[PDB]
Amino acid sequence: ARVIKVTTKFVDDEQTAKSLVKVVEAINQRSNGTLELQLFTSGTLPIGKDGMEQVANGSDWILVDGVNFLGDYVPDYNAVTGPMLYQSFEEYLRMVKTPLVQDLNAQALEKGIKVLSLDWLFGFRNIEAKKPIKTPEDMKGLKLRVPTSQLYTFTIEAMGGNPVAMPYPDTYAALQQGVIDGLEGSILSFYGTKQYENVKEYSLTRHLLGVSAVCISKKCWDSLTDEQRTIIQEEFDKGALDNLTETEKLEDEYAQKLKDNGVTFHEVDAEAFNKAVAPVYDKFPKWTPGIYDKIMENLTQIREDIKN
């Protein structure tokens, strides 16, 4: 039986990790004993940059982490996941299916990474701090934790704050010791990881979309049989779907629990933050020329169809 390590940042309480358990269950059983996927959560195995380096280098390894980690190999990914880019899940889910992004998946395959899915949404990310934010002026001074990614660092700097890059498992201690003053993330993350025990003011900037890619090494993928590739693809797709509808169901429920734990939700000057992050799109030289303009062309098209 072929052992494949599935590694992820998500703690056991988070929806993504709950969905991954079902996915591994199903894949292992459908393989009639030929595959043994093993799920490692909470960053117990390498994640982010160290995780993807394993995928890219041919390991028997599936990584479930941000789309931004694909971008260290195929730069255009960070543009497709830009700040204030999407207003809804459906906008992103459709962008992902365009030939523009399917081409990105193939550039990634040149690099040793087989992208199985970009559909593992977990929500729009907001400020989790100790003061309300209405404007970028308010952000001034705050040491805010960001994921280890240029896109997140640049975005938060552009919003007025001082980004401090670290993997999520390091956040709790950083908050306890005063190294950081807050962080950012979606409702499901906020509640799932219980950060409301440390920070009570939640400001709705909706700056980025929290979204995981699911990636397996080209070398392992190619070495499998046809039936095994079918089973793995089908089950991660069914998982993406489970994860998505659970996320849509839980956001409302969780926000109410967050309020019951003394979290106050704050509205933001949307127009201001929008003008504030616009320079982030001019901060990546390795993007293919005109990528923002082509993204916008699809996004505009996608929006028209949604209205109709």
Ligand SMILES: O=P(O)(O)OC[C@H](O)CO
């Ligand atoms: O995207 P991250 O790195 O901030 O982590 C979000 C997860 O919900 C935390 O386990």
Ligand SMILES: [Zn+2]
């Ligand atoms: Zn566990």
Ligand SMILES: [Zn+2]
């Ligand atoms: Zn089961």
Ligand SMILES: [Zn+2]
């Ligand atoms: Zn749809």
Ligand SMILES: [Zn+2]
């Ligand atoms: Zn307020």
Ligand SMILES: [Zn+2]
């Ligand atoms: Zn520009």
